[PDB]
Amino acid sequence: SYPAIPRIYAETTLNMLLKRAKKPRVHSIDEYLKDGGYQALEKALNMSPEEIIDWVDKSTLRGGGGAGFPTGKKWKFAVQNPGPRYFICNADESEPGTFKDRIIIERDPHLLIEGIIISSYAIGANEAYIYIRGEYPAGYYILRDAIEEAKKKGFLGKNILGSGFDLEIYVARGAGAYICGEETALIESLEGKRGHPRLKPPYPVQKGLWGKPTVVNNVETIANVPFIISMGWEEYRYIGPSDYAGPKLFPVSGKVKKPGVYELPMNTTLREVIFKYAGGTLGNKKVKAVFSGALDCFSSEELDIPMDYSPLGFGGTGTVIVLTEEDDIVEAALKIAEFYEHETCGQCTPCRVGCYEQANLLEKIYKGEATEQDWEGFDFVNRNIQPTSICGLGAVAGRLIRQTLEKFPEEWEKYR
């Protein structure tokens, strides 16, 4: 018995990451095994760690946590440093609009676990962590139970299946901070501290948890690893466009008919995501904007872009929030400002004061209480959150809002 979870809709054209997670319930180990689960692990343990890294490299797999970094390359960087090494699954998923990772955790936990074990083996980590946000309590209990199932079947513990490879997976919980999804703040939190990002370099792959080489990978990234081993890198690379191969998860929300998570190839366009897969708009209203989580704002003229990590592609985590013609862009911008206000960790001065002032002033603008100086101040602060920032939050806290100023000037001018 687990806490109540909303039954998020899920749909797949590839039947990989969502093969089981398309059904909104927990799939336990027996069901997983019936689908050939943990056979990829067995195959992996008969390969060298170096071979596994090579396969993940050649697969073209990129991270699903936002930065799209090539996964095999990340692993290679970690293993050029002396051990011991640590592997961390980032299940902090707290960006607005983003709910893709939870359906893997909650419905197909063994897919994630299998990926963690293979990945840990590849980089020589004997200790792995899952860091799951505090507001996913069901996911936490589900993972704890699934880990015990895996232990009972001999996929975790010492000398896994006679390989000589040892692994324990520890499940840690967050306690309400978006910043703890940033890989260095996550590590600080795992060490029992506040979630304060560290100056990089060094990067976690060189000096991470307890100062040792540490690989942090997103849930979605790790869930790909069993498929790469099972199919082989070549067959995997045949999925989707050859430069951005394999499945991607797209959490679609807002003013669409079928909000939910879609597993699709990355040559799918944004227009197709909304209209071909997510059923079009509520009431068949015109699309006004798409927010890529709290990162970017695409206009209705930008819907024909690929959902890949190319320069002109959608990128990010594939988070699609749809606003239609009657939605007030300034009201939406305020919500985005409020998010960054609430999540800056405050270490850097322009971020600390800028995230606060951006929201403070935008609220005045929205309520019709802004002076001329508040308007000018808002413009200034929005352009000046990033200076001296040591993590991505400060770098992007003004980005989406600036895009709305550029793409929807007529709505803003109404408020001025």
Partner 1 sequence: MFKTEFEFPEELKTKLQEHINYFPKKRQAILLCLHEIQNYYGYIPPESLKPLADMLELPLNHVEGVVAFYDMFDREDKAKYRIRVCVSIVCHLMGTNKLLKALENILGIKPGEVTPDGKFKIVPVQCLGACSEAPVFMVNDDEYKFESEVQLNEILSRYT
Ligand X SMILES: Cc1cc2nc3c(=O)[nH]c(=O)nc-3n(C[C@H](O)[C@H](O)[C@H](O)COP(=O)(O)O)c2cc1C
Residues that bind Cl ion (CB under 5 A): 43, 46
Secondary structure, 3-state, the chain: CCCCCCCCCEEECCCCCCCCCCCCCCCCHHHHHHCCCCHHHHHHCCCCHHHHHHHHHHHCCECCCCCCCEHHHHHHHHHCCCCCEEEEEEECCCCCCCCHHHHHHHHCHHHHHHHHHHHHHHHCEEEEEEEECCCCHHHHHHHHHHHHHHHHCCCCECCHHHCCCCEEEEEEECCCCHHHHCHHHHHHHHCCCCCCCCCCCCCCCCCCHHHCCEEEEEHHHHHHHHHHHHHCHHHHHCCCCCCCCCEEEEEEEECECCCEEEEEECCCEHHHHHHHHCCCEHHHCCEEEEEECCCEEEEHHHCCCECCCCCCCCCCCCCEEEEECCCCHHHHHHHHHHHHHHHCCCCCHHHHHHHHHHHHHHHHHHCCCCCHHHHHHHHHHHCCCCCCCCCHHHHHCCHHHHHHHHHCHHHHHHHC
| Binding interface with ligand SF4 (CB under 6 A) | 179, 197, 344-348, 351-352, 389-391, 393-394
Examine residue 284 and tell whether it contacts a copy of itself (CB under 8 A): no
| Size of site (CB under 6 A) for ligand X | 21
Does 188 participate in binding ligand X (rule CB under 6 A)? no
Judged by beta carbon, residue 183 or residue 357, the one nearer ligand X is: 183
Q: Rounded to a whole number, what is the distance in angstroms from the first to the last CA of the chain?
A: 54
Shortest reach from residue 130's CB to ligand SF4, in Å: 23
Q: Is the peptide bond before 311 cis (omega within 30 degrees of 0)?
A: no
Residue 345 interacting partner from Cl ion, a copy of itself, ligand SF4, none (CB closer than 5 to 8 Å by kind):
ligand SF4
In whole angstroms, how close is the CB of 304 to ligand X at the nearest point?
A: 26
Count the site residues for partner 1 by CB under 8 A: 65
- Give the binding range for partner 1 (CB under 8 A) out of 57-65, 66-74, 189-197, 218-226: 189-197
Q: Binding to partner 1 by residue 104, rule CB under 8 A? A: no
Distance between CA atoms of residues 393 and 243, nearest Å? 28
Binder to ligand X among 18, 41, 64, 405 (CB under 6 A)? 64
* Residue 69 touching ligand X (CB under 6 A): yes
Task: State which of positions 92-151 bind ligand X (CB under 6 A).
Answer: 92-94
Q: Which residues, numbered 359-378, are part of the site for ligand X (CB under 6 A)?
A: none
Among 54, 145, 272, 327, which residue interacts with Na ion (rule: CB under 5 A)?
A: 54
Q: Which is nearer to a copy of itself, 161 or 305 (CB)?
A: 161
252: contact with partner 1 by CB under 8 A: yes
State which residue, 163 or 388, has the beta carbon closest to Cl ion: 163
Listed ranges 213-221, 262-270, 279-287, 319-327: which one lies at the site for ligand X (CB under 6 A): 213-221
In the complex, the residues that contact partner 1 under the rule CB under 8 A are: 3-9, 30, 33-36, 39, 93-99, 101-102, 127, 133-138, 170, 172-178, 189-195, 251-255, 259-261, 291, 294, 321, 323, 327, 331-332, 335-336, 338-339, 342-343
Residues in touch with a copy of itself (CB under 8 A):
1-2, 7, 9, 23-26, 152-154, 157-159, 162
Query: What residue ranges bind ligand X (CB under 6 A)?
Result: 63-67, 69, 90, 92-94, 179, 181-183, 216-218, 221, 391-393
